[PDB]
Design a protein around this motif. Structure first.
Motif, PDB file in Angstrom:
ATOM      1  N   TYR A 158      -4.315  15.615   7.396  1.00  0.00           N
ATOM      2  CA  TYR A 158      -4.034  15.011   6.090  1.00  0.00           C
ATOM      3  C   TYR A 158      -3.112  13.806   6.256  1.00  0.00           C
ATOM      4  O   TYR A 158      -3.366  12.722   5.717  1.00  0.00           O
ATOM      5  CB  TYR A 158      -3.415  16.025   5.104  1.00  0.00           C
ATOM      6  CG  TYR A 158      -2.933  15.362   3.832  1.00  0.00           C
ATOM      7  CD1 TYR A 158      -3.825  15.055   2.810  1.00  0.00           C
ATOM      8  CD2 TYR A 158      -1.592  15.014   3.657  1.00  0.00           C
ATOM      9  CE1 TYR A 158      -3.391  14.417   1.632  1.00  0.00           C
ATOM     10  CE2 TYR A 158      -1.155  14.385   2.490  1.00  0.00           C
ATOM     11  CZ  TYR A 158      -2.064  14.083   1.488  1.00  0.00           C
ATOM     12  OH  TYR A 158      -1.659  13.474   0.330  1.00  0.00           O
ATOM     13  N   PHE A 159      -2.037  13.997   7.013  1.00  0.00           N
ATOM     14  CA  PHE A 159      -1.087  12.905   7.175  1.00  0.00           C
ATOM     15  C   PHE A 159      -1.707  11.759   7.950  1.00  0.00           C
ATOM     16  O   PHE A 159      -1.439  10.586   7.644  1.00  0.00           O
ATOM     17  CB  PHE A 159       0.216  13.379   7.805  1.00  0.00           C
ATOM     18  CG  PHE A 159       1.138  14.071   6.836  1.00  0.00           C
ATOM     19  CD1 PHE A 159       1.773  13.362   5.834  1.00  0.00           C
ATOM     20  CD2 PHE A 159       1.374  15.426   6.932  1.00  0.00           C
ATOM     21  CE1 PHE A 159       2.628  14.003   4.932  1.00  0.00           C
ATOM     22  CE2 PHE A 159       2.220  16.063   6.047  1.00  0.00           C
ATOM     23  CZ  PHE A 159       2.848  15.356   5.051  1.00  0.00           C
ATOM     24  N   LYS A 160      -2.559  12.064   8.932  1.00  0.00           N
ATOM     25  CA  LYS A 160      -3.216  10.963   9.661  1.00  0.00           C
ATOM     26  C   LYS A 160      -4.073  10.089   8.723  1.00  0.00           C
ATOM     27  O   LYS A 160      -3.972   8.831   8.681  1.00  0.00           O
ATOM     28  CB  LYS A 160      -4.085  11.492  10.828  1.00  0.00           C
ATOM     29  CG  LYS A 160      -4.441  10.381  11.839  1.00  0.00           C
ATOM     30  CD  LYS A 160      -5.304  10.894  12.980  1.00  0.00           C
ATOM     31  CE  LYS A 160      -5.427   9.845  14.080  1.00  0.00           C
ATOM     32  NZ  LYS A 160      -6.212  10.394  15.228  1.00  0.00           N
ATOM     33  N   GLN A 161      -4.917  10.782   7.966  1.00  0.00           N
ATOM     34  CA  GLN A 161      -5.799  10.150   6.994  1.00  0.00           C
ATOM     35  C   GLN A 161      -5.029   9.269   5.986  1.00  0.00           C
ATOM     36  O   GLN A 161      -5.313   8.055   5.827  1.00  0.00           O
ATOM     37  CB  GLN A 161      -6.598  11.256   6.295  1.00  0.00           C
ATOM     38  CG  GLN A 161      -7.819  10.805   5.494  1.00  0.00           C
ATOM     39  CD  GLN A 161      -8.690  11.994   5.007  1.00  0.00           C
ATOM     40  OE1 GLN A 161      -8.434  13.160   5.334  1.00  0.00           O
ATOM     41  NE2 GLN A 161      -9.722  11.687   4.229  1.00  0.00           N
ATOM     42  N   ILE A 162      -4.039   9.862   5.321  1.00  0.00           N
ATOM     43  CA  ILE A 162      -3.287   9.091   4.331  1.00  0.00           C
ATOM     44  C   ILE A 162      -2.501   7.945   4.966  1.00  0.00           C
ATOM     45  O   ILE A 162      -2.380   6.903   4.352  1.00  0.00           O
ATOM     46  CB  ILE A 162      -2.361   9.944   3.415  1.00  0.00           C
ATOM     47  CG1 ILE A 162      -1.115  10.399   4.168  1.00  0.00           C
ATOM     48  CG2 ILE A 162      -3.111  11.118   2.852  1.00  0.00           C
ATOM     49  CD1 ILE A 162       0.008  10.831   3.260  1.00  0.00           C
ATOM     50  N   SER A 163      -1.992   8.120   6.188  1.00  0.00           N
ATOM     51  CA  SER A 163      -1.285   7.029   6.882  1.00  0.00           C
ATOM     52  C   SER A 163      -2.161   5.786   6.991  1.00  0.00           C
ATOM     53  O   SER A 163      -1.724   4.643   6.745  1.00  0.00           O
ATOM     54  CB  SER A 163      -0.844   7.457   8.287  1.00  0.00           C
ATOM     55  OG  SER A 163       0.223   8.389   8.241  1.00  0.00           O
TER      56      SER A 163
ATOM     57  N   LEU B 227      -2.870   6.078  -4.143  1.00  0.00           N
ATOM     58  CA  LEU B 227      -3.371   7.142  -3.278  1.00  0.00           C
ATOM     59  C   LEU B 227      -3.772   8.368  -4.096  1.00  0.00           C
ATOM     60  O   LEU B 227      -4.878   8.906  -3.967  1.00  0.00           O
ATOM     61  CB  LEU B 227      -2.295   7.585  -2.285  1.00  0.00           C
ATOM     62  CG  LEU B 227      -2.743   8.724  -1.354  1.00  0.00           C
ATOM     63  CD1 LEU B 227      -3.808   8.241  -0.326  1.00  0.00           C
ATOM     64  CD2 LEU B 227      -1.575   9.346  -0.642  1.00  0.00           C
TER      65      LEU B 227
ATOM     66  N   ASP C 247      -4.748   5.166   4.980  1.00  0.00           N
ATOM     67  CA  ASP C 247      -4.922   4.624   3.616  1.00  0.00           C
ATOM     68  C   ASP C 247      -3.742   3.782   3.070  1.00  0.00           C
ATOM     69  O   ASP C 247      -3.942   2.743   2.410  1.00  0.00           O
ATOM     70  CB  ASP C 247      -5.240   5.730   2.615  1.00  0.00           C
ATOM     71  CG  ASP C 247      -6.650   6.251   2.747  1.00  0.00           C
ATOM     72  OD1 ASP C 247      -7.607   5.446   2.724  1.00  0.00           O
ATOM     73  OD2 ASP C 247      -6.790   7.480   2.864  1.00  0.00           O
ATOM     74  N   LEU C 248      -2.523   4.256   3.315  1.00  0.00           N
ATOM     75  CA  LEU C 248      -1.324   3.555   2.872  1.00  0.00           C
ATOM     76  C   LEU C 248      -1.238   2.226   3.623  1.00  0.00           C
ATOM     77  O   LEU C 248      -0.937   1.185   3.018  1.00  0.00           O
ATOM     78  CB  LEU C 248      -0.067   4.421   3.077  1.00  0.00           C
ATOM     79  CG  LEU C 248       0.094   5.646   2.150  1.00  0.00           C
ATOM     80  CD1 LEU C 248       1.193   6.564   2.636  1.00  0.00           C
ATOM     81  CD2 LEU C 248       0.349   5.249   0.696  1.00  0.00           C
ATOM     82  N   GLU C 249      -1.547   2.254   4.925  1.00  0.00           N
ATOM     83  CA  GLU C 249      -1.654   0.998   5.672  1.00  0.00           C
ATOM     84  C   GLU C 249      -2.608   0.036   4.987  1.00  0.00           C
ATOM     85  O   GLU C 249      -2.285  -1.144   4.825  1.00  0.00           O
ATOM     86  CB  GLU C 249      -2.095   1.198   7.123  1.00  0.00           C
ATOM     87  CG  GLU C 249      -2.309  -0.137   7.846  1.00  0.00           C
ATOM     88  CD  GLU C 249      -2.580   0.011   9.332  1.00  0.00           C
ATOM     89  OE1 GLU C 249      -3.676   0.501   9.686  1.00  0.00           O
ATOM     90  OE2 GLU C 249      -1.697  -0.371  10.138  1.00  0.00           O
TER      91      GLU C 249
END
Lengths: 75, 97
Positions: free
Chosen positions: B34-39, B62, B41-43
């Motif tokens: 989850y954190f990899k994916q959202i990282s 997000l 996206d936020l980038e």
């Protein structure tokens, strides 16, 4: 026990994108989206188990659930 | 690299029923994913706005993209419902309602 390890969140995101800077308190919304993710995952898993008449949560429940919810978690 | 105790406590808190050890290790794996994916996206949000910082608006976008923030379910309500007082104070020092 609702208190978040803010430093930890910052480090996780650092791990994945070392040059992303989080502005003040944005980590609190990140942590919020994480809680909402685990909430969704918990509900999906429980439903899988229910579907099996399984009285406890098993790895296959969480595996199928994670696939579904991670898909829902796209940005 | 998030603490497994915190993840088990949150997860059990929501699931409300017993979970095997292996299931929990799965939830941990999923959390890392989850954190990899959202990282990423936020980038995209930041890079797109031409800046190096994540701003509140980025994370709201997000959560809107995740189906979480909607017209029926605004962010302030998710904050009120799900975060402790000391955090709400920081996020909502004045009513945005």
């Amino acid at each position: 026990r609702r208190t978040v390890p803010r430093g930890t969140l910052r480090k996780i995101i650092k791990k994945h994108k070392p040059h992303l800077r989080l502005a003040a308190n944005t980590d609190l919304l990140v942590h919020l989206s994480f809680l909402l993710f685990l909430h969704r995952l918990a509900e999906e898993a429980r439903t899988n188990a229910f579907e099996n008449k399984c009285k406890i949560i098993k790895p296959e429940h969480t595996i199928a659930a994670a696939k579904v919810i991670l898909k829902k978690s796209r940005g | 690299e998030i603490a497994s105790s915190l993840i088990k406590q949150i997860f059990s808190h929501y699931v409300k029923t017993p979970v095997t050890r292996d299931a929990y290790k799965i939830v941990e794996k999923c959390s890392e994913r989850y954190f990899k994916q959202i990282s990423s996206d936020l980038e995209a949000y930041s890079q797109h706005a031409g800046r190096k910082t994540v701003e509140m608006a980025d994370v709201e976008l997000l959560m809107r993209r995740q189906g979480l923030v909607t017209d029926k379910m605004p962010l302030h309500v998710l904050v009120e419902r799900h975060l402790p007082l000391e955090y709400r104070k920081l996020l909502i020092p004045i009513a945005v309602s």
